[PDB]
Structure formats: C-alpha cells, structure tokens
C-alpha cells in the first residue's frame, strides 16, 4: 500500500521486519548518494532529523566539511526488492536544511521544487513519462564490468533466450514489485540494448523513481552475474542510449496541450511551449548531456538528433509530437541521455517551457523533411541550428546564459561549471590509442 504518516512508516517497519533504512539523495553532478541507518534510530530520526556531511552534495569538488540537517519524508518510504536472510531493507528520501533552519539551495531536489512552485503560480502541473535505455554486458573472471555482448538481437527482437533471459525477466518483476507500473519493456536497436518505459505520472515522483531505478537494476545484474551500464555510447558503430522525456501540462485537471478545434489538435499554449524549448535548448544542453561520452552519441547517422527542429511525423527531429491526442497529448524531447541528472534536467525543461508560454514565443514552421539529407546551404537557408558538438562548446554556451543561472541558482551554477570544466581539461590532454594507430607509422 501507500505510506503517508510516520506512524504508518513505523508500523510497516515493525510488521515487515525492516532492519536497515537507507537515505537517498543525489549530488549536483547526478551521482547517487546514500547512507545507512539502523531501524531503532528511525523514530528519533523522524523527530529531529539526521545530521550529515552536506559537502557531499557539492560534487567531487568539495573542499571543506559542512553540516546540514536532513528531515525525512514519510511519503517516500519504500522497500527494496531483495530479501536478505538478515531482514528486509527499505529506503527513504527527505529535504536538506541548513543549521539555521533555512533550506539548502544547493540541493538538486530543491531546484526542481522551486520550478514546480513557479509552474503552480500559473496553475499548471507537469506529468513526465521517460523512456530509459541501458545495456547488459558480461562480467570478467574478477567481477569487473566489461563490454562483452550477451546477444545480437535487433529492434523489438525476442532476445535473449539463454540464461540472460531470466535476468531480464527478474529486472521487470523487481520493478513491478515496488509499484513502478512499467508501461512496456523491449529490446532496442543495438545488440544487448534494452528499453523500459515508465508510467505517465507526476514529475516529482517520476524523478525519484528514475534515481531509484538506476541502482535497483545495477544491483540485480551483479547478483545474477551480469552488468548493466548507462553510458550514452559504450560502443562505436551502434546506437547509443538516450532518455526521451514525454511531458504534458495540466490545468484544472485537464490537459492544456489538447485542442479539438485546431487542425493539428494542439492548443496555442503547446505552440508557445515548444517555442520556449527551442529558444533555450542550446544553453542548458550541458545539463542534459553532462559527460564527455554523451557527445559521441550526438553525431549524424543514427537516431540521436543533432539539429534543432520539431515535427509531427518525422522522428529525427529534436522534438517529436506523438500521434496520440486527447488526455494523452504529450511532447517528446529526444536530447537527454540517462547520465543526466533527472532533477536538474526536468527543472530546466519545465522552466524553459513556461518562459515560452509567458512570452508567447513562436516555434516556427515544422520540418517534415529529412534534415540529414539536406545540404549546408539548405540548412543555412532554412535557418536550422545545431546542438553543441562537444562538451567544451556546451559549457561555453551554458556559461553566458543568464536564464540558466537564474533557474539553477548561483550556488549550483558555479559548482556545476567548475566540476565540468576540470573534467574537460583532463580529457583534452590525453593521447588516445586511436592517434597512435593512425599517426605512429605515417609520421
């Protein structure tokens, strides 16, 4: 069932014999952070909160120990889908507060909550259903992750059929055991690549589920002898893993994108919402694609979009509008990848759309043709822009964007840039083996 109060949470712990409670939160860069709490400490923790080292939320660029207090949220209580012989295990979330009592503005979760409040000021609320894609590789003799494939299936194929089939089934059952309400799971285009579609639900709950989904799948694969990876592009020559984000806005319990009186069955607000996204998508591209590997996926010749356009029938467009209408009307953004931070990505995605609605930004004419087949002169004539080519270019765009700074806050903005800046500098000075193969003998 659903737990609401701390009394209900305590009753469930005693009833089902939960021995350990694990907090859950993410840092600025999207890594999942957690620590364990004995079951007996839970009652005291609900009363006064737990002190911890809040400097862990500032990424790996932390310098000084700082103390903030975490106040648990009973509504987020859930039980992990594995049963150790010792006892049951459960997880819980909460809010971060400074010692003086003010909420800590560096928390990515707090960033999303502020965005929700801004949307609520205009009466709107967002529902997001993401589609997460991941790989399933083998493990070496020492248990370290590898890139060995498990099958050579294709799109929607009925694979695998060996022992790896049971591992895939176990992941589906474990997610359903927690009430995830999976829509559909299927094979993806690349070999040993799978996709899972989440139920179309509230944005705040979805973001927490996405974080929970990541380490649940990874834990299951280890105990079955496999490894699940979320790299945006682990192999060259095959499709990468992306996280498309279907979204919709609801006012007064009704979808606002649907308009029965328009030829495209789309409301005027939906046009503005797309217009806002297109205008600002270049600026916060770093948030949606936070690692260097993310831009190996964003290359022409695959399903990944590298051009800024919106369409109804075309699929290569950055923003795709599914043919579904009515209450199910939705807008799909195809840029993000699973390595992104769901809290930051959704918050910017919401904030960008609202700014377009507020300012009535015209999205322009849709692109129903194949952009990849057009020439540069055609693209220049049509005024079609392109996403940043590499991480360094994305940082330069995001670094002068005042809209991103205003939305994310000063603290998160500065910390995110410095962490990415140091990461890029380390990468740019490495001599890759590809250079040796091409240049050692020629020169």
Output 25 or 295, the one with its CB closest to a second copy: 25
Q: Are 296 and 304 in contact, with CB atoms under 8 Å apart?
A: no
CA distance linking residue 339 with residue 355, whole number of Å: 26
| Binding of a second copy by 33 (CB under 8 A) | yes
The interface mask with a second copy, positions 294-313, x = CB under 8 A, is: -------------------x
Q: Which of residues 176-235 bind Mg ion (CB under 5 A)?
A: 195
Phi, psi for 76 (deg, rounded to 5)? -95, 5
Output 195 or 423, the one with its CB closest to Mg ion: 195
Q: Which is catalytic among the residues 107, 131, 151, 269? A: 131
CA distance linking residue 205 with residue 341, whole number of Å: 14
The interface mask with Mg ion, positions 141-180, x = CB under 5 A, is: ----------------------------------------
Identify which range of 32-40, 104-112, 284-292, 432-440 contacts a second copy by CB under 8 A.
32-40
Phi, psi for 4 (deg, rounded to 5)? -115, -50
Whole-number Cα distances in Å, 225 to 3, 222, 229: 34, 5, 14
Question: DSSP 3-state assignment of 271?
Answer: helix
> Is 435 among the residues known to form the active site?
no
| Binding of a second copy by 95 (CB under 8 A) | no
> Is 15 among the residues known to form the active site?
no
Burial class (CB in 10 A: 0-12, 13-18, 19+), 416: buried
Q: Residues annotated as binding site for Mg(2+)?
A: 131, 133, 188, 195, 244, 332
Q: Which of residues 312-351 bind a second copy (CB under 8 A)?
A: 313-316, 320, 322-324
CA distance linking residue 260 with residue 326, whole number of Å: 8
Q: Residues annotated as binding site?
A: 131, 133, 183, 188, 195, 239-240, 244, 248, 297, 303, 315, 320, 332, 334
Q: Work out whether strand 319-320 and strand 310-311 pair parallel, antiparallel, or are unpaired.
A: parallel
Q: Residues annotated as binding site for ATP?
A: 183, 248, 315, 320
Signed CA dihedral, 272, 274, 278, 284: sign only: positive
| Binding of a second copy by 170 (CB under 8 A) | yes
| Binding of a second copy by 64 (CB under 8 A) | yes
Q: How far is the CB of 311 from Mg ion (least distance, A)?
A: 17
Query: CA nearest 387: which of 314, 294, 320, 311?
Result: 294
Q: Residues annotated as binding site for L-glutamate?
A: 239-240, 297, 303, 315, 334
Query: Which residues are catalytically annotated?
Result: 53, 131, 133, 188, 195, 244, 315, 332, 334
């Amino acid at each position: 069932k659903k737990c609401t109060t701390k009394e209900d949470v305590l009753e469930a712990v005693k009833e089902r014999d939960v021995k350990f409670i694990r907090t859950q939160f993410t840092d600025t860069l999207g890594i999942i952070k957690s620590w364990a709490i004995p079951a007996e400490q839970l009652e005291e923790a609900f009363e006064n909160g737990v002190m911890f080292d809040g400097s862990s939320i500032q990424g790996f660029t932390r310098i000084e120990e700082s103390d903030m207090k975490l106040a648990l949220d009973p509504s987020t209580f859930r039980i992990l889908p594995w049963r150790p012989a010792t006892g049951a295990v459960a997880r819980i979330l909460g809010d971060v507060y400074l010692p003086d009592g003010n909420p800590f503005k560096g928390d990515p979760r707090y960033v999303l909550k502020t965005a929700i409040k801004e949307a609520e000021k205009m009466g709107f609320s967002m529902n997001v259903g993401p589609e997460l894609e991941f790989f399933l590789f083998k493990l070496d003799a020492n248990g370290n992750p590898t890139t060995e494939l498990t099958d050579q299936g294709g799109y929607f194929d009925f694979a695998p059929l060996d022992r790896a089939q049971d591992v895939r089934r176990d992941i589906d059952y474990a997610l359903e055991h927690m009430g995830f309400q999976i829509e559909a799971s299927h094979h993806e285009v690349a070999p040993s690549q799978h996709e899972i579609d989440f139920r179309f639900g509230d944005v705040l709950c979805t973001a927490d589920n996405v974080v929970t989904f990541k380490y649940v799948v990874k834990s299951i694969a280890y105990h079955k002898g496999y490894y699940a990876s979320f790299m945006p592009k682990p192999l060259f020559g095959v499709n990468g893993s992306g996280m498309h984000s279907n979204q919709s806005l609801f006012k007064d319990g009704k979808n606002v994108f649907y308009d029965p009186d328009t030829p495209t069955k789309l409301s005027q607000d939906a046009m503005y919402y797309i217009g806002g996204l297109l205008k600002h998508i270049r600026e916060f591209t770093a948030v949606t694609n936070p690692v260097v590997n993310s831009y190996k996926r964003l290359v022409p010749g695959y399903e990944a979009p590298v051009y800024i356009s919106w369409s109804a029938q075309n699929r290569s467009s950055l923003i795709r509008i599914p043919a579904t209408r009515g209450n199910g009307t939705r807008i799909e953004l195809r840029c993000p990848d699973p390595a992104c931070n769901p809290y930051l990505a959704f918050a910017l995605m919401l904030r960008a759309g609202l700014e377009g609605i507020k300012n009535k930004i015209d999205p322009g004419e849709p692109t129903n043709v194949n952009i990849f087949h057009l020439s540069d002169k055609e693209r220049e004539e049509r005024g079609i822009r392109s996403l940043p080519a590499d991480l360094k270019e994305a940082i330069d765009e995001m670094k002068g964007s005042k809209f991103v700074k205003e939305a994310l806050g000063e603290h998160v903005f500065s910390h995110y840039l410095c962490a990415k800046e140091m990461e890029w500098d380390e990468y740019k000075a490495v001599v890759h083996p590809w250079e040796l193969s091409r240049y050692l003998s020629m020169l």
